[PDB]
Amino acid sequence: ANYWLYKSEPFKWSWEMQKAKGETGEEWTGVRNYQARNNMRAMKIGDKGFFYHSNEGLDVVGIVEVCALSHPDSTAEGDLKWDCVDIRAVCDMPQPVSLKDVKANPKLEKMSLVTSMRLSVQPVTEEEYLEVCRMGGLANPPKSPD
């Protein structure tokens, strides 16, 4: 199963706004990075991931799931190389996990969140996902499809 992480600046799109969208979800527009785009193209319906507040907050505040496979980005004015998935809230992270705590955990040293400086949509290994979830108060967290 594949797990992911989505960076979102709370000033622009916060976790609260994400939850407010409910089951309708939110189109993940604005990605203009090939690797991030390709990560979205690798996602399947139901894949779980972290909603991380970037720029401000700097913490994992919730878990989301993919509710729409990669499709043309409605903000890319009918372009061809920019596409994205739609994601929706699954549950809050009981105790939001700070970037500081992540960087202090040896088991998370290879996590994209701490190694990549420009990737807005990233992969998360199953072990990294389970560890961050535990740190955040989630023993048996939501799982991605096999």
Side-chain angles (χ1 to χ4, degrees):
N2 300 315
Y3 293 88
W4 315 92
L5 180 146
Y6 313 76
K7 294 190 173 183
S8 191
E9 300 182 0
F11 187 99
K12 290 178 169 54
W13 188 251
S14 69
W15 173 234
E16 291 290 354
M17 295 173 97
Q18 182 61 57
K19 290 189 294 184
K21 288 306 298 292
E23 55 92 10
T24 296
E26 178 73 4
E27 185 187 4
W28 213 241
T29 62
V31 173
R32 301 294 182 265
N33 177 286
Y34 298 116
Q35 175 53 206
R37 176 201 67 182
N38 294 345
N39 283 161
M40 288 189 292
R41 290 176 177 181
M43 295 173 187
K44 298 184 186 68
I45 293 301
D47 276 3
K48 304 298 187 299
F50 294 135
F51 190 99
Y52 174 87
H53 277 167
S54 57
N55 193 197
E56 291 182 291
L58 308 180
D59 51 356
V60 175
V61 296
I63 294 181
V64 294
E65 67 184 358
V66 173
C67 52
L69 295 174
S70 290
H71 63 265
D73 184 334
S74 70
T75 68
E77 47 82 57
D79 198 358
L80 213 173
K81 54 182 176 178
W82 297 132
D83 41 63
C84 56
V85 294
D86 284 19
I87 60 173
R88 61 187 170 191
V90 174
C91 65
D92 307 304
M93 181 62 82
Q95 292 78 58
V97 185
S98 70
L99 176 65
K100 181 175 180 298
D101 289 339
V102 170
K103 290 185 176 183
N105 194 326
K107 302 169 66 181
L108 306 180
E109 297 200 310
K110 297 178 179 296
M111 196 178 174
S112 186
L113 180 63
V114 299
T115 63
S116 300
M117 295 299 106
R118 294 174 39 260
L119 193 63
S120 71
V121 182
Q122 317 168 164
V124 175
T125 70
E126 187 176 2
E127 277 287 272
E128 284 162 0
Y129 176 81
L130 293 171
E131 179 66 2
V132 170
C133 281
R134 274 189 293 276
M135 294 169 74
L138 286 181
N140 282 301
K143 306 294 172 57
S144 289
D146 298 297

